[PDB]
Design a protein around this ligand. Structure first.
Ligand SMILES: Nc1ncnc2c1ccn2[C@@H]1O[C@H](CO)[C@@H](O)[C@H]1O
Ligand SMILES: Nc1ncnc2c1ccn2[C@@H]1O[C@H](CO)[C@@H](O)[C@H]1O
Ligand SMILES: [Cl-]
Length: 345
């Protein structure tokens, strides 16, 4: 039985806008398969353009938020998880804030100065391509000051486990760095997600620095390849990356075990740790084509599933199965939708 605020996350609270996109959209905005981009000016028309389309699905998002609130949902004990993010003073931000309260997730949202609106993600869904365009908006205003407030920082201090996605590097690196240093200093469990290929390519220093404070690092095949190329791991890139990341020294240079898990879609995931000379394969659930509804957020769920079991003392393999279950649950659902806890099986 975990104490209240045992798990802490900070991240980008965003609204997912899920649309059945036409094929021209992907060529028009130069969007790649399963890719994530931070919007530039050339992307900005996308948001008004998709508003013209029917059947829009508006649902709470944000990688870190998805994970931490599903941990909360899994554990069922009220207020075990706490989350910090920056939203805007708009209806979207309030919707997200109410979504959290409904899940018994303790939050301390920073509110961005008007008229900076809550961030949003355009999720373009089609048969051939899945792609995301991110407008961070209010999420960028998350500040070290907000975090260092006594009523906020106290959430961090009582936390024994942290989850922060790589995505937070673009919004509040100073905050996530401070918390990571606190975690390693008090021998707590800091969990980190590689989140997206562009982070390893363009924010390599921040990624590697975070890794040096991370006890558990989550990644997928795509991120592992981008990471590996950047570090000159030309042969056996994915395996080489798992080994490299696992073996990277901790910030204080102390000998410690860092667990690394690299998911590979429908194919077996890889895992290893610093003390393990080998990399293991773990088979995952098989899906027929018609069973796959929407894989978006599967990675977020995977992490939540693993952590929720691992921090309660379940062994590695047991925790990996719980991670796949969490991921499979999201896969059979549209958006990061958490239904009634009873029907989780
Ligand atoms: N097409 C598929 N078939 C079965 N599982 C899938 C997919 C795609 C993703 N996943 C599950 O999500 C986890 C993290 O991506 C992966 O670990 C994995 O469990
Ligand atoms: N730059 C970012 N920072 C934080 N979260 C992000 C992004 C971009 C996309 N997402 C979130 O990722 C979820 C899918 O795993 C989607 O639910 C989507 O909201
Ligand atoms: Cl995030």
């Amino acid at each position: 039985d975990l104490s209240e605020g045992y798990v802490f996350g900070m991240g980008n609270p965003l609204l997912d806008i899920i649309v059945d996109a036409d094929d021209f959209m992907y060529r028009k905005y130069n969007l790649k398969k399963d890719n994530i981009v931070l919007a530039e000016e050339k992307h900005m028309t996308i948001y008004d353009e998709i508003q013209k389309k029917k059947k829009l699905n508006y649902i709470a998002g944000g990688a870190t938020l998805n994970t931490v609130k599903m941990i909360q949902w899994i554990i069922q004990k009220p207020f075990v998880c706490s989350y910090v993010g920056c939203i805007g003073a708009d209806i979207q931000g309030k919707y997200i804030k109410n979504d959290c309260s409904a899940l018994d997730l303790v939050t301390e949202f920073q509110i961005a100065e008007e008229p900076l609106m809550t961030g949003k993600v355009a999720v373009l869904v089609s048969e051939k391509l899945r792609s995301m365009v991110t407008y961070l908006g209010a999420a960028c205003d998350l500040s070290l000051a907000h975090i260092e407030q006594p009523h906020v920082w106290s959430l961090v201090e009582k936390a024994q486990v942290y989850y922060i996605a790589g995505f937070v590097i673009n919004t509040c690196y100073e905050g996530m760095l401070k918390i990571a240093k606190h975690s390693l200093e008090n021998e707590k469990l800091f969990c980190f997600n590689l989140s997206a290929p562009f982070l390893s390519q363009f924010n390599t220093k921040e990624v590697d620095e975070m890794i040096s404070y991370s006890n558990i690092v989550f990644g997928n095949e795509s991120e592992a390849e981008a990471y590996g190329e950047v570090h000159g791991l030309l042969e056996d890139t994915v395996h080489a990356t798992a080994r490299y990341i696992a073996d990277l020294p901790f910030a204080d240079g102390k000998k410690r075990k860092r667990l690394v898990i690299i998911t590979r879609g429908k194919n077996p995931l890889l895992y290893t740790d610093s003390s393990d000379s080998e990399i293991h394969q773990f088979m995952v659930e098989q899906f027929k084509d018609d069973q796959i509804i929407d894989t978006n957020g599967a990675g977020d769920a995977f992490a939540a599933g693993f952590i929720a079991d691992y921090i309660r003392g379940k062994p590695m393999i047991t925790s990996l199965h719980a991670a796949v279950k969490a991921a499979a649950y999201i896969i059979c659902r549209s958006g990061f939708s958490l239904g009634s806890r009873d029907s989780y099986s």
